[PDB]
Amino acid sequence: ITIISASQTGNARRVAEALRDDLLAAKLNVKLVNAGDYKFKQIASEKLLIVVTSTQGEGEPPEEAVALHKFLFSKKAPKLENTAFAVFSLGDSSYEFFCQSGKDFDSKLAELGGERLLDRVDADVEYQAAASEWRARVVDALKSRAPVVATGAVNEIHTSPYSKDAPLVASLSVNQKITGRNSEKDVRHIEIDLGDSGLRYQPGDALGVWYQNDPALVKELVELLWLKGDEPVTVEGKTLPLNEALQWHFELTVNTANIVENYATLTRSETLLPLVGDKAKLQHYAATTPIVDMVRFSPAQLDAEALINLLRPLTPRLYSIASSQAEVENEVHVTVGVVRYDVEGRARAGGASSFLADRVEEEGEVRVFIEHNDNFRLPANPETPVIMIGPGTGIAPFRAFMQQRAADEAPGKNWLFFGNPHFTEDFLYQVEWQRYVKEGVLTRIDLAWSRDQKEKVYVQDKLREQGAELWRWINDGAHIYVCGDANRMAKDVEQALLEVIAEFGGMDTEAADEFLSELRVERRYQRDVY
Ligand SMILES: Cc1cc2nc3c(=O)[nH]c(=O)nc-3n(C[C@H](O)[C@H](O)[C@H](O)COP(=O)(O)OP(=O)(O)OC[C@H]3O[C@@H](n4cnc5c(N)ncnc54)[C@H](O)[C@@H]3O)c2cc1C
Ligand SMILES: Cc1cc2nc3c(=O)[nH]c(=O)nc-3n(C[C@H](O)[C@H](O)[C@H](O)COP(=O)(O)O)c2cc1C
Known about the structure:
It is an enzyme of class 1 (oxidoreductase). The protein has 19 helices and 20 strands. It is an alpha/beta fold. A six-stranded antiparallel sheet has the order 11-8-15-6-7-12. A five-stranded parallel sheet has the order 2-1-3-4-5, with helices on both faces. A five-stranded parallel sheet has the order 18-17-16-19-20, with helices on both faces. Helix 5 crosses helix 6, helix 5 packs parallel to helix 9 and helix 7 crosses helix 8. The site of flavin mononucleotide has 20 residues, from helix 1.
């Protein structure tokens, strides 16, 4: 933000100073320069340019602004592309040309391509009236609602005031374990109350969930480094106790090759030095050793700033939305697989998933936003058939699909392929599926239980078993959806779809692949895999 003051007896400067003190209290973009010193030749690169000028000699500018005026009214003045500006004008009404100077600058700057931030404002002798409120909306219009440099806070969600950087403060209503006692996995059905926010979402969207690290994990980490936890550290320019920085502001539950390498170097660890510069060794160590355990295994003294400088900022996690608002109204449901594992007998857990499962009380606060996915959507035609492939937690959006199609009483046929280790332990939402089958909403359902018999069975095996009927549905205009594990499931499922298409469509592998690519183009093959 560049405030140019053009003044003869200092009134315009008093205003422009009154504006340097406002912006100074708001944004970090404020610099006050006199017109007589302003290097106008480089003006095009002004991101935010506010002019405060009085008027002299029948509309003549103040003396100090005369060169700047001639250079803007000159045949050689620069066109402006990324310049936002405003103009406040001072003068005396009794004169023929009231506020010529301020008028000139306002007209000419926009005529060079400058983005008019506010409408120009004039004022007579008694100017602390018009000036006191102009200075007001400028600070607002020059806040995040029209930024350039300092503080932006820009996000994207339908027409909402809520976004990833300004999330909704919601509350946790339901937190329920939906895998059986003998499951190898902890899966939670989560209902979050949206209150009166008006936050909206469609099936296929995901929920962005901010979280905090486990205070126990922060404490274990802080101790192993021989810190106590109240050491001050700088986080985004402000000063926090270490514990608060670690709990709220940095990733602790994900290790990376870079972190291993940096930590090896900082500590000269004999265990870790040998991995330095070997990307595959570093990645493998990160993947098997959480940060807190890397520290255990390679003790070293680090001060608080050295630790926090090691870490990446904390980021929210996404969770496919498992409800339809037509059915649940001012709520959002998710299906959370809690990452739980052990390192030499010490319990470890993913940050967000264990935050929701273990560290938020009923009615407890949860900060959320919507991640819109326009490329994962039910057909617009309520009669088009729908094929859904979502084993594990990939089941979530298909709960939302069926809540929606049932709410709309869509007559389209629906087909679910689901899979997990055990029928008696891992049939997520079994009793709802039975109800959908009973009610005629869920037309077909095929299940793959990978650990209920000797040989492994997965959804791709049921896709192959169902080849003939799948191809029939595909020729009836069916949309195919795949949600869940990217690394293995989505690939094996795509391979099985290609085999079905090749076989029952009578084409070779390259033709099947082009056919599936045509379904993508047609938005009839959509995936949300992660
Ligand atoms: C579009 C989208 C939709 C999603 N939908 C869902 C959904 O419906 N349900 C769902 O549950 N998730 C879903 N996810 C995944 C979700 O966003 C998270 O990534 C997941 O919950 C893990 O995050 P976390 O914070 O719990 O764990 P993190 O702390 O981020 O990650 C866990 C870490 O632990 C490590 N780790 C795991 N096991 C071991 C081990 N044995 N030894 C050493 N290290 C280990 C991993 O390497 C990883 O570094 C979705 C993701 C996307 C992008
Ligand atoms: C000699 C003189 C000529 C002026 N001519 C004009 C004029 O032509 N048009 C106008 O609107 N104001 C005119 N003014 C009014 C001044 O611009 C007004 O007093 C203003 O507040 C000056 O503020 P400053 O202290 O920043 O110079 C004139 C003032 C003086 C002293």
